[PDB]
mmCIF file with all atom_site columns, N, CA and C in Angstrom:
data_model
loop_
_atom_site.group_PDB
_atom_site.id
_atom_site.type_symbol
_atom_site.label_atom_id
_atom_site.label_alt_id
_atom_site.label_comp_id
_atom_site.label_asym_id
_atom_site.label_entity_id
_atom_site.label_seq_id
_atom_site.pdbx_PDB_ins_code
_atom_site.Cartn_x
_atom_site.Cartn_y
_atom_site.Cartn_z
_atom_site.occupancy
_atom_site.B_iso_or_equiv
_atom_site.pdbx_formal_charge
_atom_site.auth_seq_id
_atom_site.auth_comp_id
_atom_site.auth_asym_id
_atom_site.auth_atom_id
_atom_site.pdbx_PDB_model_num
ATOM 1   N N  . UNK I 1 1  ? 0.938  -1.320 0.266   1.00 0.00 ? 1  UNK I N  1
ATOM 2   C CA . UNK I 1 1  ? 0.019  -0.062 -0.020  1.00 0.00 ? 1  UNK I CA 1
ATOM 3   C C  . UNK I 1 1  ? 0.092  0.823  0.100   1.00 0.00 ? 1  UNK I C  1
ATOM 4   N N  . UNK I 1 2  ? 0.614  2.154  -0.908  1.00 0.00 ? 2  UNK I N  1
ATOM 5   C CA . UNK I 1 2  ? 1.689  3.008  -1.315  1.00 0.00 ? 2  UNK I CA 1
ATOM 6   C C  . UNK I 1 2  ? 0.966  4.576  -1.004  1.00 0.00 ? 2  UNK I C  1
ATOM 7   N N  . UNK I 1 3  ? 2.271  5.173  -0.544  1.00 0.00 ? 3  UNK I N  1
ATOM 8   C CA . UNK I 1 3  ? 1.811  6.932  -0.436  1.00 0.00 ? 3  UNK I CA 1
ATOM 9   C C  . UNK I 1 3  ? 1.183  7.297  -1.633  1.00 0.00 ? 3  UNK I C  1
ATOM 10  N N  . UNK I 1 4  ? 0.321  7.569  -2.212  1.00 0.00 ? 4  UNK I N  1
ATOM 11  C CA . UNK I 1 4  ? -0.101 8.360  -3.908  1.00 0.00 ? 4  UNK I CA 1
ATOM 12  C C  . UNK I 1 4  ? -0.804 9.346  -3.334  1.00 0.00 ? 4  UNK I C  1
ATOM 13  N N  . UNK I 1 5  ? 0.050  10.871 -3.460  1.00 0.00 ? 5  UNK I N  1
ATOM 14  C CA . UNK I 1 5  ? -0.881 12.222 -2.862  1.00 0.00 ? 5  UNK I CA 1
ATOM 15  C C  . UNK I 1 5  ? -1.777 12.261 -4.293  1.00 0.00 ? 5  UNK I C  1
ATOM 16  N N  . UNK I 1 6  ? -1.092 14.252 -5.007  1.00 0.00 ? 6  UNK I N  1
ATOM 17  C CA . UNK I 1 6  ? -2.030 14.400 -6.634  1.00 0.00 ? 6  UNK I CA 1
ATOM 18  C C  . UNK I 1 6  ? -3.787 14.597 -6.332  1.00 0.00 ? 6  UNK I C  1
ATOM 19  N N  . UNK I 1 7  ? -4.185 15.631 -5.614  1.00 0.00 ? 7  UNK I N  1
ATOM 20  C CA . UNK I 1 7  ? -5.374 15.740 -5.133  1.00 0.00 ? 7  UNK I CA 1
ATOM 21  C C  . UNK I 1 7  ? -5.713 16.579 -7.039  1.00 0.00 ? 7  UNK I C  1
ATOM 22  N N  . UNK I 1 8  ? -5.809 17.465 -8.353  1.00 0.00 ? 8  UNK I N  1
ATOM 23  C CA . UNK I 1 8  ? -6.089 17.818 -8.995  1.00 0.00 ? 8  UNK I CA 1
ATOM 24  C C  . UNK I 1 8  ? -5.398 17.812 -10.566 1.00 0.00 ? 8  UNK I C  1
ATOM 25  N N  . UNK I 1 9  ? -4.488 18.209 -10.248 1.00 0.00 ? 9  UNK I N  1
ATOM 26  C CA . UNK I 1 9  ? -3.975 18.114 -11.957 1.00 0.00 ? 9  UNK I CA 1
ATOM 27  C C  . UNK I 1 9  ? -2.360 16.332 -12.292 1.00 0.00 ? 9  UNK I C  1
ATOM 28  N N  . UNK I 1 10 ? -1.128 16.634 -11.726 1.00 0.00 ? 10 UNK I N  1
ATOM 29  C CA . UNK I 1 10 ? -0.058 16.794 -11.717 1.00 0.00 ? 10 UNK I CA 1
ATOM 30  C C  . UNK I 1 10 ? -0.396 14.812 -11.351 1.00 0.00 ? 10 UNK I C  1
ATOM 31  N N  . UNK I 1 11 ? -0.211 13.935 -12.823 1.00 0.00 ? 11 UNK I N  1
ATOM 32  C CA . UNK I 1 11 ? -0.048 12.282 -12.516 1.00 0.00 ? 11 UNK I CA 1
ATOM 33  C C  . UNK I 1 11 ? 0.988  11.715 -11.552 1.00 0.00 ? 11 UNK I C  1
ATOM 34  N N  . UNK I 1 12 ? 1.806  12.004 -11.517 1.00 0.00 ? 12 UNK I N  1
ATOM 35  C CA . UNK I 1 12 ? 3.368  10.901 -10.509 1.00 0.00 ? 12 UNK I CA 1
ATOM 36  C C  . UNK I 1 12 ? 2.848  10.290 -9.194  1.00 0.00 ? 12 UNK I C  1
ATOM 37  N N  . UNK I 1 13 ? 3.086  8.378  -9.442  1.00 0.00 ? 13 UNK I N  1
ATOM 38  C CA . UNK I 1 13 ? 2.279  8.229  -7.620  1.00 0.00 ? 13 UNK I CA 1
ATOM 39  C C  . UNK I 1 13 ? 3.862  8.467  -6.493  1.00 0.00 ? 13 UNK I C  1
ATOM 40  N N  . UNK I 1 14 ? 4.046  8.301  -5.653  1.00 0.00 ? 14 UNK I N  1
ATOM 41  C CA . UNK I 1 14 ? 5.021  8.122  -4.311  1.00 0.00 ? 14 UNK I CA 1
ATOM 42  C C  . UNK I 1 14 ? 4.550  6.514  -4.031  1.00 0.00 ? 14 UNK I C  1
ATOM 43  N N  . UNK I 1 15 ? 5.965  6.300  -4.094  1.00 0.00 ? 15 UNK I N  1
ATOM 44  C CA . UNK I 1 15 ? 6.694  4.921  -3.437  1.00 0.00 ? 15 UNK I CA 1
ATOM 45  C C  . UNK I 1 15 ? 6.626  5.644  -2.246  1.00 0.00 ? 15 UNK I C  1
ATOM 46  N N  . UNK I 1 16 ? 5.758  3.693  -1.279  1.00 0.00 ? 16 UNK I N  1
ATOM 47  C CA . UNK I 1 16 ? 5.965  3.882  0.168   1.00 0.00 ? 16 UNK I CA 1
ATOM 48  C C  . UNK I 1 16 ? 7.876  4.192  1.073   1.00 0.00 ? 16 UNK I C  1
ATOM 49  N N  . UNK I 1 17 ? 8.645  3.311  -0.038  1.00 0.00 ? 17 UNK I N  1
ATOM 50  C CA . UNK I 1 17 ? 10.048 3.354  0.099   1.00 0.00 ? 17 UNK I CA 1
ATOM 51  C C  . UNK I 1 17 ? 11.015 4.687  0.148   1.00 0.00 ? 17 UNK I C  1
ATOM 52  N N  . UNK I 1 18 ? 11.097 5.517  -0.867  1.00 0.00 ? 18 UNK I N  1
ATOM 53  C CA . UNK I 1 18 ? 11.552 7.006  -0.600  1.00 0.00 ? 18 UNK I CA 1
ATOM 54  C C  . UNK I 1 18 ? 11.482 7.859  0.335   1.00 0.00 ? 18 UNK I C  1
ATOM 55  N N  . UNK I 1 19 ? 10.832 8.240  1.757   1.00 0.00 ? 19 UNK I N  1
ATOM 56  C CA . UNK I 1 19 ? 9.646  8.896  2.071   1.00 0.00 ? 19 UNK I CA 1
ATOM 57  C C  . UNK I 1 19 ? 11.797 9.581  3.815   1.00 0.00 ? 19 UNK I C  1
ATOM 58  N N  . UNK I 1 20 ? 10.837 10.872 3.571   1.00 0.00 ? 20 UNK I N  1
ATOM 59  C CA . UNK I 1 20 ? 11.899 11.993 4.928   1.00 0.00 ? 20 UNK I CA 1
ATOM 60  C C  . UNK I 1 20 ? 11.052 11.896 5.795   1.00 0.00 ? 20 UNK I C  1
ATOM 61  N N  . UNK I 1 21 ? 10.168 11.122 5.948   1.00 0.00 ? 21 UNK I N  1
ATOM 62  C CA . UNK I 1 21 ? 9.092  11.009 7.680   1.00 0.00 ? 21 UNK I CA 1
ATOM 63  C C  . UNK I 1 21 ? 9.203  12.733 8.127   1.00 0.00 ? 21 UNK I C  1
ATOM 64  N N  . UNK I 1 22 ? 7.273  13.143 8.351   1.00 0.00 ? 22 UNK I N  1
ATOM 65  C CA . UNK I 1 22 ? 6.368  13.948 8.821   1.00 0.00 ? 22 UNK I CA 1
ATOM 66  C C  . UNK I 1 22 ? 5.804  12.814 10.061  1.00 0.00 ? 22 UNK I C  1
ATOM 67  N N  . UNK I 1 23 ? 4.060  12.955 9.214   1.00 0.00 ? 23 UNK I N  1
ATOM 68  C CA . UNK I 1 23 ? 3.379  11.670 9.813   1.00 0.00 ? 23 UNK I CA 1
ATOM 69  C C  . UNK I 1 23 ? 2.383  11.731 10.908  1.00 0.00 ? 23 UNK I C  1
ATOM 70  N N  . UNK I 1 24 ? 2.347  13.421 11.598  1.00 0.00 ? 24 UNK I N  1
ATOM 71  C CA . UNK I 1 24 ? 1.526  13.385 12.842  1.00 0.00 ? 24 UNK I CA 1
ATOM 72  C C  . UNK I 1 24 ? 0.810  14.779 12.952  1.00 0.00 ? 24 UNK I C  1
ATOM 73  N N  . UNK I 1 25 ? 1.682  15.574 12.720  1.00 0.00 ? 25 UNK I N  1
ATOM 74  C CA . UNK I 1 25 ? 0.736  17.571 13.840  1.00 0.00 ? 25 UNK I CA 1
ATOM 75  C C  . UNK I 1 25 ? -0.154 17.848 12.661  1.00 0.00 ? 25 UNK I C  1
ATOM 76  N N  . UNK I 1 26 ? -1.550 17.671 13.324  1.00 0.00 ? 26 UNK I N  1
ATOM 77  C CA . UNK I 1 26 ? -2.960 18.446 13.352  1.00 0.00 ? 26 UNK I CA 1
ATOM 78  C C  . UNK I 1 26 ? -3.607 18.238 12.241  1.00 0.00 ? 26 UNK I C  1
ATOM 79  N N  . UNK I 1 27 ? -4.642 18.614 11.242  1.00 0.00 ? 27 UNK I N  1
ATOM 80  C CA . UNK I 1 27 ? -5.526 18.416 10.166  1.00 0.00 ? 27 UNK I CA 1
ATOM 81  C C  . UNK I 1 27 ? -4.473 18.485 8.773   1.00 0.00 ? 27 UNK I C  1
ATOM 82  N N  . UNK I 1 28 ? -3.610 19.488 8.918   1.00 0.00 ? 28 UNK I N  1
ATOM 83  C CA . UNK I 1 28 ? -2.207 19.601 7.537   1.00 0.00 ? 28 UNK I CA 1
ATOM 84  C C  . UNK I 1 28 ? -1.685 18.889 7.393   1.00 0.00 ? 28 UNK I C  1
ATOM 85  N N  . UNK I 1 29 ? -1.059 17.639 7.178   1.00 0.00 ? 29 UNK I N  1
ATOM 86  C CA . UNK I 1 29 ? -0.153 16.675 7.352   1.00 0.00 ? 29 UNK I CA 1
ATOM 87  C C  . UNK I 1 29 ? 0.590  16.532 6.106   1.00 0.00 ? 29 UNK I C  1
ATOM 88  N N  . UNK I 1 30 ? 1.714  17.376 6.572   1.00 0.00 ? 30 UNK I N  1
ATOM 89  C CA . UNK I 1 30 ? 2.880  18.104 5.375   1.00 0.00 ? 30 UNK I CA 1
ATOM 90  C C  . UNK I 1 30 ? 3.535  16.442 4.992   1.00 0.00 ? 30 UNK I C  1
ATOM 91  N N  . UNK I 1 31 ? 3.221  16.016 3.826   1.00 0.00 ? 31 UNK I N  1
ATOM 92  C CA . UNK I 1 31 ? 3.845  15.210 2.738   1.00 0.00 ? 31 UNK I CA 1
ATOM 93  C C  . UNK I 1 31 ? 5.083  15.725 2.273   1.00 0.00 ? 31 UNK I C  1
ATOM 94  N N  . UNK I 1 32 ? 6.586  14.422 2.125   1.00 0.00 ? 32 UNK I N  1
ATOM 95  C CA . UNK I 1 32 ? 7.407  14.718 2.676   1.00 0.00 ? 32 UNK I CA 1
ATOM 96  C C  . UNK I 1 32 ? 8.163  13.610 2.328   1.00 0.00 ? 32 UNK I C  1
ATOM 97  N N  . UNK I 1 33 ? 9.126  13.071 0.636   1.00 0.00 ? 33 UNK I N  1
ATOM 98  C CA . UNK I 1 33 ? 9.484  12.292 -0.265  1.00 0.00 ? 33 UNK I CA 1
ATOM 99  C C  . UNK I 1 33 ? 11.084 12.651 -0.383  1.00 0.00 ? 33 UNK I C  1
ATOM 100 N N  . UNK I 1 34 ? 11.824 11.928 -0.261  1.00 0.00 ? 34 UNK I N  1
ATOM 101 C CA . UNK I 1 34 ? 12.994 12.140 -1.151  1.00 0.00 ? 34 UNK I CA 1
ATOM 102 C C  . UNK I 1 34 ? 13.675 11.811 -2.060  1.00 0.00 ? 34 UNK I C  1
ATOM 103 N N  . UNK I 1 35 ? 13.791 13.192 -3.070  1.00 0.00 ? 35 UNK I N  1
ATOM 104 C CA . UNK I 1 35 ? 13.721 12.290 -4.623  1.00 0.00 ? 35 UNK I CA 1
ATOM 105 C C  . UNK I 1 35 ? 14.973 12.645 -4.640  1.00 0.00 ? 35 UNK I C  1
ATOM 106 N N  . UNK I 1 36 ? 15.946 12.834 -4.778  1.00 0.00 ? 36 UNK I N  1
ATOM 107 C CA . UNK I 1 36 ? 17.189 12.026 -5.371  1.00 0.00 ? 36 UNK I CA 1
ATOM 108 C C  . UNK I 1 36 ? 18.783 12.950 -3.830  1.00 0.00 ? 36 UNK I C  1
ATOM 109 N N  . UNK I 1 37 ? 18.683 14.295 -3.782  1.00 0.00 ? 37 UNK I N  1
ATOM 110 C CA . UNK I 1 37 ? 20.072 14.288 -2.868  1.00 0.00 ? 37 UNK I CA 1
ATOM 111 C C  . UNK I 1 37 ? 19.852 15.170 -1.451  1.00 0.00 ? 37 UNK I C  1
ATOM 112 N N  . UNK I 1 38 ? 19.093 16.334 -1.697  1.00 0.00 ? 38 UNK I N  1
ATOM 113 C CA . UNK I 1 38 ? 18.052 17.527 -0.487  1.00 0.00 ? 38 UNK I CA 1
ATOM 114 C C  . UNK I 1 38 ? 17.101 17.956 -1.064  1.00 0.00 ? 38 UNK I C  1
ATOM 115 N N  . UNK I 1 39 ? 16.042 17.973 -2.046  1.00 0.00 ? 39 UNK I N  1
ATOM 116 C CA . UNK I 1 39 ? 15.196 17.944 -2.626  1.00 0.00 ? 39 UNK I CA 1
ATOM 117 C C  . UNK I 1 39 ? 13.770 17.599 -2.485  1.00 0.00 ? 39 UNK I C  1
ATOM 118 N N  . UNK I 1 40 ? 12.632 18.155 -1.489  1.00 0.00 ? 40 UNK I N  1
ATOM 119 C CA . UNK I 1 40 ? 11.857 17.020 -0.954  1.00 0.00 ? 40 UNK I CA 1
ATOM 120 C C  . UNK I 1 40 ? 10.517 17.619 -1.537  1.00 0.00 ? 40 UNK I C  1
ATOM 121 N N  . UNK I 1 41 ? 10.065 16.808 -1.737  1.00 0.00 ? 41 UNK I N  1
ATOM 122 C CA . UNK I 1 41 ? 8.728  17.136 -2.614  1.00 0.00 ? 41 UNK I CA 1
ATOM 123 C C  . UNK I 1 41 ? 7.193  17.602 -1.912  1.00 0.00 ? 41 UNK I C  1
ATOM 124 N N  . UNK I 1 42 ? 6.423  18.878 -1.791  1.00 0.00 ? 42 UNK I N  1
ATOM 125 C CA . UNK I 1 42 ? 5.978  19.169 -0.450  1.00 0.00 ? 42 UNK I CA 1
ATOM 126 C C  . UNK I 1 42 ? 4.185  19.134 -1.256  1.00 0.00 ? 42 UNK I C  1
ATOM 127 N N  . UNK I 1 43 ? 3.868  17.981 -0.642  1.00 0.00 ? 43 UNK I N  1
ATOM 128 C CA . UNK I 1 43 ? 2.911  17.869 -0.651  1.00 0.00 ? 43 UNK I CA 1
ATOM 129 C C  . UNK I 1 43 ? 0.920  17.783 0.754   1.00 0.00 ? 43 UNK I C  1
ATOM 130 N N  . UNK I 1 44 ? 0.052  16.748 0.221   1.00 0.00 ? 44 UNK I N  1
ATOM 131 C CA . UNK I 1 44 ? -1.158 16.840 1.543   1.00 0.00 ? 44 UNK I CA 1
ATOM 132 C C  . UNK I 1 44 ? -1.954 15.543 1.317   1.00 0.00 ? 44 UNK I C  1
ATOM 133 N N  . UNK I 1 45 ? -1.699 15.044 2.491   1.00 0.00 ? 45 UNK I N  1
ATOM 134 C CA . UNK I 1 45 ? -2.654 14.338 2.250   1.00 0.00 ? 45 UNK I CA 1
ATOM 135 C C  . UNK I 1 45 ? -3.161 13.794 3.606   1.00 0.00 ? 45 UNK I C  1
ATOM 136 N N  . UNK I 1 46 ? -4.629 14.419 3.696   1.00 0.00 ? 46 UNK I N  1
ATOM 137 C CA . UNK I 1 46 ? -5.283 14.320 5.463   1.00 0.00 ? 46 UNK I CA 1
ATOM 138 C C  . UNK I 1 46 ? -6.258 13.832 6.219   1.00 0.00 ? 46 UNK I C  1
ATOM 139 N N  . UNK I 1 47 ? -7.311 12.237 5.282   1.00 0.00 ? 47 UNK I N  1
ATOM 140 C CA . UNK I 1 47 ? -7.256 11.368 5.991   1.00 0.00 ? 47 UNK I CA 1
ATOM 141 C C  . UNK I 1 47 ? -7.283 9.461  4.639   1.00 0.00 ? 47 UNK I C  1
ATOM 142 N N  . UNK I 1 48 ? -8.412 9.835  3.445   1.00 0.00 ? 48 UNK I N  1
ATOM 143 C CA . UNK I 1 48 ? -9.649 9.458  2.719   1.00 0.00 ? 48 UNK I CA 1
ATOM 144 C C  . UNK I 1 48 ? -7.548 8.440  2.167   1.00 0.00 ? 48 UNK I C  1
ATOM 145 N N  . UNK I 1 49 ? -7.296 8.939  1.376   1.00 0.00 ? 49 UNK I N  1
ATOM 146 C CA . UNK I 1 49 ? -6.088 8.568  0.994   1.00 0.00 ? 49 UNK I CA 1
ATOM 147 C C  . UNK I 1 49 ? -4.742 8.073  1.969   1.00 0.00 ? 49 UNK I C  1
ATOM 148 N N  . UNK I 1 50 ? -4.690 7.865  2.920   1.00 0.00 ? 50 UNK I N  1
ATOM 149 C CA . UNK I 1 50 ? -3.745 7.093  4.182   1.00 0.00 ? 50 UNK I CA 1
ATOM 150 C C  . UNK I 1 50 ? -3.759 6.095  3.550   1.00 0.00 ? 50 UNK I C  1
ATOM 151 N N  . UNK I 1 51 ? -2.773 5.207  4.339   1.00 0.00 ? 51 UNK I N  1
ATOM 152 C CA . UNK I 1 51 ? -2.841 3.787  3.993   1.00 0.00 ? 51 UNK I CA 1
ATOM 153 C C  . UNK I 1 51 ? -2.531 2.803  5.746   1.00 0.00 ? 51 UNK I C  1
ATOM 154 N N  . UNK I 1 52 ? -2.615 1.578  5.185   1.00 0.00 ? 52 UNK I N  1
ATOM 155 C CA . UNK I 1 52 ? -3.031 1.186  6.895   1.00 0.00 ? 52 UNK I CA 1
ATOM 156 C C  . UNK I 1 52 ? -1.476 0.788  7.402   1.00 0.00 ? 52 UNK I C  1
ATOM 157 N N  . UNK I 1 53 ? -0.807 0.757  6.729   1.00 0.00 ? 53 UNK I N  1
ATOM 158 C CA . UNK I 1 53 ? 0.645  0.032  7.300   1.00 0.00 ? 53 UNK I CA 1
ATOM 159 C C  . UNK I 1 53 ? 1.231  1.185  7.940   1.00 0.00 ? 53 UNK I C  1
ATOM 160 N N  . UNK I 1 54 ? 1.749  2.144  7.680   1.00 0.00 ? 54 UNK I N  1
ATOM 161 C CA . UNK I 1 54 ? 1.739  3.353  8.439   1.00 0.00 ? 54 UNK I CA 1
ATOM 162 C C  . UNK I 1 54 ? 1.414  3.513  10.156  1.00 0.00 ? 54 UNK I C  1
ATOM 163 N N  . UNK I 1 55 ? -0.295 3.317  10.245  1.00 0.00 ? 55 UNK I N  1
ATOM 164 C CA . UNK I 1 55 ? -0.832 3.450  11.170  1.00 0.00 ? 55 UNK I CA 1
ATOM 165 C C  . UNK I 1 55 ? -0.835 2.582  12.357  1.00 0.00 ? 55 UNK I C  1
ATOM 166 N N  . UNK I 1 56 ? -0.801 0.648  11.716  1.00 0.00 ? 56 UNK I N  1
ATOM 167 C CA . UNK I 1 56 ? -0.236 -0.406 12.726  1.00 0.00 ? 56 UNK I CA 1
ATOM 168 C C  . UNK I 1 56 ? 1.446  -0.090 13.209  1.00 0.00 ? 56 UNK I C  1
ATOM 169 N N  . UNK I 1 57 ? 2.911  -0.296 12.210  1.00 0.00 ? 57 UNK I N  1
ATOM 170 C CA . UNK I 1 57 ? 3.382  -0.246 12.475  1.00 0.00 ? 57 UNK I CA 1
ATOM 171 C C  . UNK I 1 57 ? 4.622  1.354  12.223  1.00 0.00 ? 57 UNK I C  1
ATOM 172 N N  . UNK I 1 58 ? 4.368  2.326  13.336  1.00 0.00 ? 58 UNK I N  1
ATOM 173 C CA . UNK I 1 58 ? 4.465  4.234  12.932  1.00 0.00 ? 58 UNK I CA 1
ATOM 174 C C  . UNK I 1 58 ? 6.360  3.383  13.791  1.00 0.00 ? 58 UNK I C  1
ATOM 175 N N  . UNK I 1 59 ? 7.035  3.402  13.998  1.00 0.00 ? 59 UNK I N  1
ATOM 176 C CA . UNK I 1 59 ? 6.717  2.462  15.152  1.00 0.00 ? 59 UNK I CA 1
ATOM 177 C C  . UNK I 1 59 ? 6.636  1.712  15.152  1.00 0.00 ? 59 UNK I C  1
ATOM 178 N N  . UNK I 1 60 ? 7.739  0.843  15.556  1.00 0.00 ? 60 UNK I N  1
ATOM 179 C CA . UNK I 1 60 ? 7.908  -1.021 15.691  1.00 0.00 ? 60 UNK I CA 1
ATOM 180 C C  . UNK I 1 60 ? 7.599  -2.200 15.736  1.00 0.00 ? 60 UNK I C  1
ATOM 181 N N  . UNK I 1 61 ? 6.738  -2.786 15.728  1.00 0.00 ? 61 UNK I N  1
ATOM 182 C CA . UNK I 1 61 ? 6.085  -3.961 16.601  1.00 0.00 ? 61 UNK I CA 1
ATOM 183 C C  . UNK I 1 61 ? 6.292  -5.558 16.260  1.00 0.00 ? 61 UNK I C  1
ATOM 184 N N  . UNK I 1 62 ? 6.289  -6.116 17.221  1.00 0.00 ? 62 UNK I N  1
ATOM 185 C CA . UNK I 1 62 ? 6.565  -7.538 18.146  1.00 0.00 ? 62 UNK I CA 1
ATOM 186 C C  . UNK I 1 62 ? 5.821  -8.613 18.537  1.00 0.00 ? 62 UNK I C  1
#
């Protein structure tokens, strides 16, 4: 289950491997992915497009 953003225009799907990590604060949750060196792509994931795997293992569970 991959973190796919993209509400109105742009096509490209973002994979769950390349991730800079925020995923907590408030109503607007900032989408951060490592592109190459250090140039991060800003976006939005509120509640409907967010996957199951990020909620259960946040935080690695044995």
